[PDB]
Amino acid sequence: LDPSGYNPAKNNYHPVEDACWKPGQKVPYLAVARTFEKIEEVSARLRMVETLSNLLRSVVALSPPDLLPVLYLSLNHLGPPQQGLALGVGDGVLLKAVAQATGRQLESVRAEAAEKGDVGLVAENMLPPPPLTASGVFSKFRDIARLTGSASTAKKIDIIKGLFVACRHSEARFIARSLSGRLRLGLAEQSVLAALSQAVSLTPPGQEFPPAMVDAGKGKTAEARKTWLEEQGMILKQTFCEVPDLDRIIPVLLEHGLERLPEHCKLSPGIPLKPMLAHPTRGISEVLKREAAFTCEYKYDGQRAQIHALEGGEVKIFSRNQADNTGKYPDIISRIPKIKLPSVTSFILDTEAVAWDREKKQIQPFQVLTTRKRKEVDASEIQVQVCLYAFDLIYLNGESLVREPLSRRRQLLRENFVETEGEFVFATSLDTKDIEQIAEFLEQSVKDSCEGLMVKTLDVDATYEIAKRNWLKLKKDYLDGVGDTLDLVVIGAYLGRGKRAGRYGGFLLASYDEDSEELQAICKLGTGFSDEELEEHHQSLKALVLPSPRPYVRIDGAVIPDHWLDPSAVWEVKCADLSLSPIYPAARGLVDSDKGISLRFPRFIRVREDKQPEQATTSAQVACLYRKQSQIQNQ
DNA sequence: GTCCGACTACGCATCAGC
């Protein structure tokens, strides 16, 4: 009756009686908002899943059509990933609507949200319009994302204001958080899926209301109930891993149930699937710890792109995040038949796209790959060539290869696909087991301009069932002593948002150009320190805050830190590679005439108390490390 | 170990302001 006191975390929660809306009527957003409250209140994931499951049970019982917008609102998504909807709502756009919402000056509201690290609390602080609807709020979110062209921003601000005026109680918090891409419930895809699997198992969909089954975990023992829901979750997890498309799963789920879901949502070309992720290992001996026979291929520094081929001849290319990248590769849709044999009529390969120079015939760094255009590229104006390095086969002429080992998948992969020096090659896989030649193959990969070594089993736990587990990642910056260690000067600091609200979330580091007797910014640092170390910083680091920057510091086109600090702290910082920065001035001119050097994948290691600012890593050295890189020393 | 959310550089794509 009154969604203002809605409680989805109640003991012995009844889907119908404990709800806050009438069946067949739309789901109110306050019901969704009060649950997010009960989810951010706790920290146990099994508690958040049960609380969100209570929403979905009430939703599947009272308003089945509203199930999809509730899920997307929970995931903070707008639809399937291959659709490509993006809010296009900047931060400043949101606080512009926030100031337009209440009435504070944009200079005042912009300061509050920065010091708080969250706009939801800032926005929450006329006649009442009708209460907000969950599916209608999701519609306004989609309406915002589709707004494009000139003057589209001011039209987005109107829609956001139209929601913030209709917000009741805590609704203003989660509309603002969702629009900025920071719901921060502690609950995401894995827990949303577990909560949706739970709901359709306790409250089966498609029941004549009032539903004859509101709690199907009634006559079950708690032991056999946990395995019941765990077996139900696994059926949903794997189906979603083959078809990560809630616009396809929910209609089939809502009508045929969870048990019959895999019989209709099958992995087929044209629909992207979740790719197999890797896992970072410590050292070479850390790999020999599971020790089963495995293979070892290079880890190529490019972009993950899986290539689908429908039976009808159409070819599509999706990215690691299911985003449609077919318009990005006209040079691939053309060279499609150059890799397949006559017997190939349908396929899906897990490849990595790396930039390839035609003249030198060598692999280019990652920066060259990300310089290609997107949207709708014409194959005539393609100035950055790309070469596929296939390392898995998922589909082959109507058949799905999910339940097959890497040893067999690699069989048909090499059997039904022809090489092409410069356009199509297989990831160089050296099958072995001895740790002597294994570490040798790893340090070789760098000479062939690669990140490191891929390690995946061949038979034992070697399927492509991403839901069950299984791959090992091994490059150079992981082993202690093999990474480029820089002793850098902390010159800037940035106020943190969310988890790091209050203290600093980032820091601006600098090398010491001994030639100009000045500090040069090189990169930012926001990972690699413990929460006690962050509290160890920020506090001891606050006694050195200064209003104006020192004259001997130089940041060029880097973000102005929220706090300038007296250069004194010297930090040990590990990094993967070194990058040619179009933003940072460190060693500007020492390699490229205009661009400096930045750190790729930097991270904090430890503070150097014995080291002084003058006794830190110089920009002069920094240039030699960029020249000593094998990806750079191959031109 | 899982899951989540802090955070990194780089570069295309886009739009308010001019």
Side-chain angles (χ1 to χ4, degrees), chain A residues 290 292-296 298-310 312-313 315 317-332 334 337 339 342-343 345-357 363-372 374 377-380 384-392 394-402 404-406 409 412-414 416-417 419-420 422-424 426-428 431-432 434 439-442 444-446 448-450:
Chain A
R290 69 274 278 271
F294 43 70
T295 165
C296 273
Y298 293 156
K299 203 197 157 323
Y300 292 88
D301 192 39
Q303 156 219 346
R304 184 91 162 259
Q306 72 179 202
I307 297 71
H308 292 232
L310 306 117
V315 194
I317 294 142
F318 302 97
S319 97
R320 166 201 173 306
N321 296 294
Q322 291 73 66
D324 202 336
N325 289 7
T326 326
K328 184 199 217 143
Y329 302 108
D331 49 355
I332 276 278
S334 95
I339 72 147
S343 56
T345 190
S346 307
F347 63 86
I348 287 155
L349 326 91
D350 209 28
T351 89
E352 198 106 0
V354 48
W356 176 264
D357 180 274
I363 272 182
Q364 323 231 35
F366 182 65
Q367 277 146 357
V368 169
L369 203 288
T370 170
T371 44
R372 302 177 53 119
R374 333 173 189 250
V377 182
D378 287 329
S380 55
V384 180
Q385 300 312 306
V386 61
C387 180
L388 304 176
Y389 287 62
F391 53 86
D392 219 319
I394 303 207
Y395 207 84
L396 210 29
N397 328 292
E399 208 185 329
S400 149
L401 311 207
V402 171
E404 228 63 64
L406 195 45
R409 298 204 297 273
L412 320 92
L413 186 49
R414 303 155 79 151
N416 310 109
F417 290 102
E419 297 277 41
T420 296
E423 168 80 279
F424 184 76
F426 291 70
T428 75
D431 311 349
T432 166
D434 67 316
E440 147 70 22
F441 203 39
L442 171 139
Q444 166 77 14
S445 47
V446 168
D448 320 62
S449 34
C450 280

Side-chain angles (χ1 to χ4, degrees), chain A residues 503-513 515-516 519-529:
Chain A
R503 56 208 101 196
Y504 304 97
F507 303 97
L508 184 48
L509 310 176
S511 61
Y512 176 54
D513 182 17
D515 195 290
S516 52
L519 278 167
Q520 308 177 329
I522 170 165
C523 79
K524 265 178 302 141
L525 215 80
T527 195
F529 26 71

Side-chain angles (χ1 to χ4, degrees), chain A residues 220-222 224-225 227-229 232:
Chain A
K220 313 247 176 168
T221 166
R225 169 184 207 267
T227 165
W228 164 54
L229 298 175
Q232 290 289 64

Side-chain angles (χ1 to χ4, degrees), chain A residues 51 285 348 395 426-427 512 556 562-563 579:
Chain A
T51 293
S285 75
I348 287 155
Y395 207 84
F426 291 70
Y512 176 54
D556 199 336
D562 303 353
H563 277 181
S579 50

